[PDB]
Design a binder for these strands. Structure first.
Lengths: 59, 140, 103
RNA sequence: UGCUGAAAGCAUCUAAGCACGAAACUUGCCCCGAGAUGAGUUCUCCCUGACCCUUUAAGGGUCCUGAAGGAACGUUGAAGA
RNA sequence: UGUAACGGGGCUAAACCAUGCACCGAAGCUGCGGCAGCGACGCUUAUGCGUUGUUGGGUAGGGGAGCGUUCUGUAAGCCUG
RNA sequence: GUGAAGAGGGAAACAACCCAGACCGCCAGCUAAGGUCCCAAAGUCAUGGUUAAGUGGGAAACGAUGUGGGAAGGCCCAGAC
RNA sequence: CCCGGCGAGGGGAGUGAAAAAGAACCUGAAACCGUGUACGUACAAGCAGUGGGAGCACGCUUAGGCGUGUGACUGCGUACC
């Protein structure tokens, strides 16, 4: 239910939650995505840029 | 200060015209259930009490691809264990949308719990742009 | 202000809540110790560049104010199933939260 | 039961493709059927005067020469548990 | 005597094998409370509070401890129409 | 290997039989073997083959112009099918 | 005084502190029942559940997460000795 707002729209853009996490968890500062990422079901129009961060390395 | 989603009855029913009919069917008939619970609408109540409405289009083109389709019997024997028996195979039965080869939910909510009242909500007609027996507000 | 606190309370991430934590090993019913344990509390979660994450520490701190967890709340099961019959046994523990978020 | 014809210039219903086929499975055959509440409908037919209470789409509640009508209405009966 | 060998349903690769890799994930060791035994410490000492080690399922046995419908007493003593 | 006066997460639901493993709580983390598209709650992942049969949860005494990988060999363009 | 069957029982009167002391005489619960405030509700499985909670007869709050139980959804499980 929580992690749906980190796949339900991202899978289309290709950003599939567990294969995007072997990407995320290369950074030793980001680990606690498991619940707190729930902000995505209403922060949408500004959450939509958090993928751009490192896209030319992370992608 | 609760995180769960009661009731919800029903918020998200996704009025999608299942162009998947035949062409890739055995890849998404297996997922009609995980649709009516999830993979997009998983955002709400991804296990309990909800409702759903895809927009059906055809029936007898189940596709299914393999030696199965021409000796796999369907049985029911609905009375006193039936006695005398029934054996018409999956492409020869699929010639009618009926009770076991058309719904997929019969295979996927299999005891009846979660499924116990919203049985016909998908319409269970078939017939394309000759007969749209479904929704009048704009489908998808 | 936003608890950056985790230890057995990490739901408390919110500005208020009011959300529970532990009641620790020692003196935990004196109201306050008046100092603040943290300063890396948030940045993005209150400014015009949002992220769900702790990239800064915006000059606000969290007070040490354990409160008054005194009146012994509901906790305690027993034991049966085969002859595993106990009806006392259950040494006490509980949860609490911080006094009032003045910031 | 063979058709053209190869696998393997042979031989050949089969391998691609063809065509019929019998208590059989299928079928508006016999016989009840959504009482299959998945709860869909056709056809033929029938009822449209005035208002009230507020926690309002929830209603709950009135008051129309009384209309054609209905089970009791007197014996019963063809079914009479 | 209803097809009844993954629980289903048989998925032409989702698979089988081989190389990578991230989530799920009993009670399972972690957050962090609480603490019955047997030991070791700071020291106290009638003896104990916390630290530190081993570790906390418990019908045959020995150890060791809690409370009562009231009888026999604390007690013309304090309590009650 | 601690079995019932042990209760149920192993290996199929063969409470005993692998063996250390549950006191007691959480809207707090997750360890192993099973898997991991599913009724089921995470990649239709990236990097390398084989298989094109429904193979996979039915083998033994044999067979067999269906093919697959490897390395040595036999006949051969003064002409081996 | 009143009522019916020139009856039973009641409804007030009243000796009474009392008729929950009324002559089927004990200041008084246990097996089972009659009408009601609300339910779940004539598609039922699986010791009739504690959960996790949606809003319902009702009763608080200048709003403030509740003081109430049949228990839509369904999760867990087989309470014995």
């Amino acid at each position: 239910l929580w992690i749906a707002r980190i796949n339900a729209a991202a899978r289309q853009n290709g950003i599939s939650y567990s294969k995007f996490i072997n990407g995320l968890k290369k950074a030793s500062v980001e680990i606690d995505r498991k619940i707190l990422a729930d902000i995505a079901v209403f922060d949408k129009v500004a959450f939509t840029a958090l993928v751009e961060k490192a896209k030319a390395a992370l992608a | 200060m609760k995180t769960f989603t009661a009731k919800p009855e029903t918020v998200k029913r996704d009025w999608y015209v299942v162009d998947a009919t035949g062409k890739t069917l055995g890849r998404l008939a297996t997922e009609l259930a995980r649709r009516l619970r999830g993979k997009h609408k998983a955002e709400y109540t991804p296990h309990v009490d909800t409702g759903d409405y895809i927009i059906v289009l055809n029936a007898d083109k189940v596709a299914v691809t393999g030696n199965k389709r021409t000796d796999k019997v369907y049985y029911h024997h609905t009375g006193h264990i039936g006695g005398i028996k029934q054996a018409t195979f999956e492409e020869m039965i699929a010639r009618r949308p009926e009770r076991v080869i058309e719904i997929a939910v019969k295979g996927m909510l299999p005891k009846g719990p979660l499924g116990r009242a919203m049985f016909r909500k998908l319409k269970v007609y078939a017939g394309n742009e000759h007969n749209h027996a479904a929704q009048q507000p704009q489908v998808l | 202000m936003y608890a950056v606190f985790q230890s057995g309370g990490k739901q408390h991430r919110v500005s208020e809540g009011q959300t529970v934590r532990l009641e620790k090993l020692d003196i935990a019913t004196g109201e306050t110790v008046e100092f603040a344990e943290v300063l890396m509390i948030a940045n993005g979660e209150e400014v015009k560049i949002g992220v769900p994450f702790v990239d800064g520490g915006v000059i606000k701190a969290e007070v040490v104010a354990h409160g008054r967890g005194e009146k012994v709340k509901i906790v305690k099961f027993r034991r049966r199933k085969h002859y595993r019959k106990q009806q006392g046994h259950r040494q006490w523990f509980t949860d609490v939260k911080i006094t009032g978020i003045s910031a």
